[PDB]
Design a protein around this ligand. Sequence first.
Ligand code: 5I1
Lengths: 244, 325
Amino acid sequence: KPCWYWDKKDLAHTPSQLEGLDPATEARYRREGARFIFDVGTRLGLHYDTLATGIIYFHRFYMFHSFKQFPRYVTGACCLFLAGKVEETPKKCKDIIKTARSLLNDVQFGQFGDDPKEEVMVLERILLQTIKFDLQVEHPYQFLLKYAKQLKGDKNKIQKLVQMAWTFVNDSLCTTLSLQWEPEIIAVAVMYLAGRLCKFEIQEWTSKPMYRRWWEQFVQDVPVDVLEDICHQILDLYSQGKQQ
Amino acid sequence: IDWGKRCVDKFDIIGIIGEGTYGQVYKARDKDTGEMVALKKVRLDNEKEGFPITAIREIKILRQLTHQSIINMKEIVTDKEDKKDKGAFYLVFEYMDHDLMGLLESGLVHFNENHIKSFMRQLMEGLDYCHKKNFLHRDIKCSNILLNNRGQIKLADFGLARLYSSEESRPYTNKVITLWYRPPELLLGEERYTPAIDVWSCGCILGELFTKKPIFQANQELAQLELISRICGSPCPAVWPDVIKLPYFNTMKPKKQYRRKLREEFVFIPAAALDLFDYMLALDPSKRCTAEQALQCEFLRDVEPSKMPPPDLPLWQDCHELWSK
Ligand SMILES: CN(C)CCCC(=O)Nc1ccc(C(=O)N2CCC[C@@H](Nc3ncc(Cl)c(-c4c[nH]c5ccccc45)n3)C2)cc1
């Protein structure tokens, strides 16, 4: 089984940054690529697991290839195409290009060259080799539901926490958080952030109410500093937007 | 890892062994390891949808199943020097020497009781591993049971497999198993079925090892249910209360209401094996033994296959079929 997690130092030496791309520009390229996959798959009515699987393929791809050698929207369409096949929600490639054509202008759609469809097809072989045919991926959503099922403090406040944590998981896919921490840790982190923004105290809802370490019942040996850093990366996406 | 990057030239192709669901299949010789392999070739773009989803499913399932009685996919190689749609993929499997169907139609090998003991032990062990994980095979038959010359049974052809949730309420595909090995609940239209469908298929394998022919040979579903009923008894709520809940129970049934003659139709089978045989061919899926229970029965409990001399088979496969068009 391969290893799919990097530290903060290795993420500062991706193939894109080695070729001169600045950290801010790669972070922007990753946001637009993830949101592109999100909007295309949404307009085709795809499962949130399928969107997340395509985005994880997208982030891992650019740990081995540079954004200067591979246009991002072509890679995003390719990742969504493979993800639908992996997640048993197949979509014809003609449909993805059609949907991509509908949301992108000609300068953005110029990345597909003269013949848009073949660019995605020939890239699928490269993507599969890059992800080492490790197709099965799990996402923070299932653990957010599993962990929240074991809270008993208040019904209406739990559902507000889950709903905000679900939105924060969607926002997380715009960052490299899935390349840093396991999905179980991301699930705990978004509950922690949602608890802060709601001023709910999550410890009251555990079987160990007296014990702030409410999350050590779900994940083992996760220090609060790790969760604080995940929150900082997520709220960084709200540099402009209102937090919620 | 390196799953996918190394090239086909690191293998020496010996010849074509057959045709699969998404391309040709080759016998091949590894340059370095000194072990033999079979390569399932995956052409892409012949189909306008790229890498076939049939391979994706087989690759995805075979990476989660590792067992001595399961076909071992070792890696995935490529033509290399791709851009360039020319490059194709190859699934690397450990080479097996025979399949059960070719072994039996050769007319050249005879399996005694101890041989069937070892085979069923290995087969039920491998299927139990698949069923303790949440996987249904849905394509068990004599041609999908592979056997080497060391006497080791291995289960193959996981293309039609899929993950199931236990006693959960989720629907599946109805026509899954080949007709001669299909259980009666599928013939009557059950779509939310269970691992008992694989156990029925293995029950057909067991009886086909003592006789030389498949035990239920029909070409249509109506006739197939008729032959099953003529031996196993007609479906009725007395033995199978839930037949009334099946889509086709009322519109397709045998002419007569048969009594179970399984122990008289196969009286030549030893007692302990006939007990497991009778257990595996229960009409009601809920009365059908699980792979775990089959390993605990009298016929298989004390079998240790590693301590039994394997039966000697033709060093290669040749059905020796008479010239027929
Ligand atoms: C009228 N009747 C029916 C046949 C008469 C003619 C006749 O003699 N046929 C005939 C059939 C096969 C062979 C043969 O070469 N073999 C025997 C079978 C296992 C092979 N090793 C093998 N090892 C591993 C795997 Cl995963 C597969 C495998 C997985 N999937 C597959 C899909 C297709 C092919 C192989 C695989 N196959 C070897 C030789 C002759």
